[PDB]
Amino acid sequence: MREIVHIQAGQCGNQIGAKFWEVISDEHGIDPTGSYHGDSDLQLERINVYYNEATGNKYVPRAILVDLEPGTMDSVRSGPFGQIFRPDNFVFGQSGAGNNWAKGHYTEGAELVDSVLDVVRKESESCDCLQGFQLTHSLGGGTGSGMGTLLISKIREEYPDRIMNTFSVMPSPKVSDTVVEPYNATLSVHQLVENTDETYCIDNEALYDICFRTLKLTTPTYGDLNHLVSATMSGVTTCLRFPGQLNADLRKLAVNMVPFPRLHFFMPGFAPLTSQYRALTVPELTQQMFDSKNMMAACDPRHGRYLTVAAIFRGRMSMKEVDEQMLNVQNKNSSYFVEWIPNNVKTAVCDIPPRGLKMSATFIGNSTAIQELFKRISEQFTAMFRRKAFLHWYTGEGMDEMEFTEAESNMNDLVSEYQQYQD
Amino acid sequence: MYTFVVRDENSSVYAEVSRLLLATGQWKRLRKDNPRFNLMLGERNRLPFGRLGHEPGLVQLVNYYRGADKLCRKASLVKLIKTSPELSESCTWFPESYVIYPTNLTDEREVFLAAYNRGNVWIAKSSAGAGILISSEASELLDFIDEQVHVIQKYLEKPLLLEPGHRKFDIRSWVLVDHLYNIYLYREGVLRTSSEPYNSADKTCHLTNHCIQKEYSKNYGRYEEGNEMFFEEFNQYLMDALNTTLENSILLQIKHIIRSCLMCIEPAISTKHLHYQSFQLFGFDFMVDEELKVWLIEVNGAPACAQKLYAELCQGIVDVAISSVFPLASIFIKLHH
Amino acid sequence: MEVIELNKCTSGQSFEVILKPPSDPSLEEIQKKLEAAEERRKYQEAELLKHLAE
Amino acid sequence: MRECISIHVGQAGVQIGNACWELYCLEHGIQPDGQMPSDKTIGGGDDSFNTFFSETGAGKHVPRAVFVDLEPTVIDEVRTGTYRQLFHPEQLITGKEDAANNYARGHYTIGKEIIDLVLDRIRKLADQCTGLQGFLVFHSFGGGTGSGFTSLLMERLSVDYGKKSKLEFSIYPAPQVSTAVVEPYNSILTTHTTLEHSDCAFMVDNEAIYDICRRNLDIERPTYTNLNRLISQIVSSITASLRFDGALNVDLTEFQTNLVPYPRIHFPLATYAPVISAEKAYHEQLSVAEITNACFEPANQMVKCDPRHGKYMACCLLYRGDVVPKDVNAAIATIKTKRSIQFVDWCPTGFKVGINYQPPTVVPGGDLAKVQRAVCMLSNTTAIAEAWARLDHKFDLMYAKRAFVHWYVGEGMEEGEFSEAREDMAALEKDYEEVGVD
């Protein structure tokens, strides 16, 4: 019994979090009312990692829904699986955060964070042995970004020996709501550098490019983007939700994937991405899984080097053929894997495939090419900050310019740390 | 697409082999410390054989046989011929040799002087040379070694002398042993000839090394280019002068010695049932006396080639030693055994 | 090729064939190291909580 | 009669232990409920199998075994397995959260909180023994518990049982089945601190077992069950002399006496033959000469290496089945005239031979075919140092960048223990070269 507590914060975090629970509930056979209606005991063997068992054989997600606006959480409560969440785990204010990291982190969010910690504490007290936490949020807004990182800091203070894991959506000018998103994201990245053990970098730029270029969606919506996040989140949590041997808990995953504490920002990938009944062979799954066009961080892996790689194949397939194709990609592109970490590519296989697919593959890379993401955010930050543009939104909440200067320096250090291991 | 690494930059043989592999477009070169290779062109000293054959999904091959140093060292060759029943002390094609340790350090001092007292010219040499002494007195030989392990063997006082010139020579043969322990003898050899007349009464006319004839010999390049005579001319000479062929008078004994030596150490160095495979190119040096008898001088484990034969031989290395294990998309004589 | 020390029983036998003749830290010290590592963990956690308190 | 206590640590140690005791019961005619009809001394006795099994007044034969794991899922398999009736709950010790492939977490952080409990449960088994020989410790090199907690347990056993012998069965890490990048760290850290506390250790490279399962059993992708059934056969061959009548390796002290002249060089190489697939309806039975010759093939060794480029310090042959001394000597004579078997000058060139007439027992429905005769060779070769060289090299690559080191320092381990452990391995690797190379 190695329980995980899930938290979703802000508009993006709750919309992506709700789809995640919708996806894995279907994979585990849980219906919108919390009743199990599956046909395999493999669905329930690790069900308690994400679900609590209540009276009447009901399964309740161990999920806490947080926002400074009621709007999106009303949509969740009215969505498909809205009734499955614990009603007391809805923690919301009324003011909103106006896409303002300072409001989420320092003013509006400080007023609400203690009531979130009460729900976290209540969920943790009913855990046989709590593994840690997973948080879904965006970095470009105010609540998920500012209040989410405030939550992570206060969760670390109360549970210092537990693993903190995040799915963090990076802003992009291609899929942008406001011009201050680079400010909010730069402020959040330093929080994540200090206070998370594992962060899946989900780049809205990559999600948009995949929907437009690959999936041939001329006008991608947020729902289209969230379909890619659902599939990715289900894939990267397969090892936690089903019986296996590799990266079966969050701490063993961090030990395998993080050779240096600050470089814990992962590039996720998924295969297939089809715009549909054709069976996909193991060589095709393996080639697509390593292709840059299947990456969710919009970073060219050939521009950097892989520190560690985790690969998860789902479905009934030849595991011998999987090992052959996995060893083929490494032996035919060994210049992109660091030679000072032997056997840094680990492969896991799960028999149960995602809904609507015979087989799939999920990629988790700790590549030094992720510095391209942080460089991109750093450049957009500096373009405005050199002229102090839009800072009044933040100084009006009590922040000083020096905190922006330090956030800027912090992320340029992070970029330089990736560069020293790429050489 | 096959992968290989290069760990001996000073190898003229395998620098050309590495150049040929890249020219095929189906072989990729990796960094020298990258373990995900199919082929290792390894270093001469302390090749880490213990780390080969442990990469899952990679058939690995190395261009050196582990343990072949027993054949390619002065004192090791003498001990191997004396103590192996396959070769025995009654070996007829190897000169009477003795392993002599310097007094500042088993040993065969009292055995060497026993046969010495019973033509009494010997030669002292070792593997630490470019340091060779040829004397008829045993006192100068034992005193020179005291001044590393050395060996003293009988100096062939009646060598076969080429005419015109009255000059000494030695025959170099290149032998390639593949991963199946097939013994391939390169059809092309070289005679490294002396350019000075042999004087049976100075070491320039007695040592036929290619470097000594180019530094201390004043007749370098006179009779043949670079003091190197190839088999076509040498065979024609044996027909015109001695009324015999190179195959009959010499090459039968050479093939016999190559087989005897390599079959002796086959149980100790074979990679037949091993987790990695080995091949190796050897350099056999032979002496011929006036009776047309062939004598083995030494075996080189990291030999160089003749400039005219680099292209042909290196392509043969790729053909039978490298492509036989890693096929892409005869100049040898197979000594069966 | 000599066989020596042949011992036979109902369930088997044993012998030796020769082919050729020849030619701690105390409990206290362990407890000290275990407690020294625990103290280093406590010091690192105190530094974290001090950092978070700032 | 002198008792032996088996201790299984971590997932590898427990799952291999489960496979071994399964084989022991089949070999001794013990049923899953603990009953042994052939045992006529009800409730007691000092027979050779009593070195591994105690007896209750109800006639149940209970393994002298302790299972320890910092996570309960693997030992819960034993609690609800086929042989659940053998063990009482005091023998199965589980924690809540594991060592996360972190030596320091298993050794320092979690080990400190559970070491006294484990020793207390071991003390309960030792109090049943009238003359305890010592301990057999099964564990992996690469796991956080198998590496970290075992080294702490071995230190405390030397304190609480100073006169007792301790033998290891150690699983050497192989990327084809391994689950952690830091396993070279854990292997070298645990070898350093265990070295002075182990009298004789049998290393088993998962790479060798994996390849033997693929090559000889035609298993395309072997599982842990396939690997552990083969490992338990080798372990059974090694411990059979403690559980059956005989005169060779009759107590744990004799293992060190016969296989370990130099105390630090206490890692004998094991080679086993024959391994025949059960899917073969009929297989030509190999002779004494053929299985004995197979003991000098690297493809049958528990650790892949080349004993031709090393020197022997000792050599035991453990036969099971239709074998008589006459055919052993005839096979050895032929092998000496064909193999490169170099002994060190300060040791006799010989073989201590043990023969048990009962042929190997196989798990019904398993992958191994029944054979009329089998042999396990235990030879102390310097060639096994190749496994140390590979391990130390992977250590050197990661540690030069201090990769993953923060995980160990964060558990209270000092960075100096890394280099201190590595220097010990360098000294160990140098000892092998002085003994085996001229």
Ligand SMILES: Nc1nc2c(ncn2[C@@H]2O[C@H](COP(=O)(O)OP(=O)(O)OP(=O)(O)O)[C@@H](O)[C@H]2O)c(=O)[nH]1
């Ligand atoms: N032969 C064999 N090897 C195993 C088995 N189980 C795990 N291993 C190997 O052991 C190593 C990992 O160590 P584990 O025993 O699983 O870890 P642990 O001792 O439980 O310690 P933790 O980190 O706390 O889980 C890997 O190299 C595995 O290949 C097994 O059943 N048989």
Ligand SMILES: Nc1ncnc2c1ncn2[C@@H]1O[C@H](COP(=O)(O)OP(=O)(O)CP(=O)(O)O)[C@@H](O)[C@H]1O
């Ligand atoms: N017993 C002997 N009788 C006559 N000449 C001999 C001899 N031993 C050696 N030589 C001469 O010495 C020369 C070189 O000797 P040796 O082969 O030991 O040196 P070396 O090994 O440094 C040359 P290589 O580059 O082929 O290894 C040969 O050309 C040969 O003519």
Ligand SMILES: Nc1nc2c(ncn2[C@@H]2O[C@H](COP(=O)(O)OP(=O)(O)O)[C@@H](O)[C@H]2O)c(=O)[nH]1
């Ligand atoms: N992928 C994805 N991104 C979103 C979604 N909603 C908002 N975003 C992104 O998140 C940022 C806006 O933050 P948001 O979550 O709406 O603000 P918050 O409610 O204050 O946390 C912008 O970068 C948006 O592009 C969504 O549903 N899916």
Ligand SMILES: [Ca+2]
């Ligand atoms: Ca207010």
Ligand SMILES: [Ca+2]
């Ligand atoms: Ca009894």
Ligand SMILES: [Ca+2]
């Ligand atoms: Ca001791």
Ligand SMILES: [Mg+2]
């Ligand atoms: Mg919004």
Ligand SMILES: [Mg+2]
């Ligand atoms: Mg030479």
Ligand SMILES: [Mg+2]
């Ligand atoms: Mg475990």
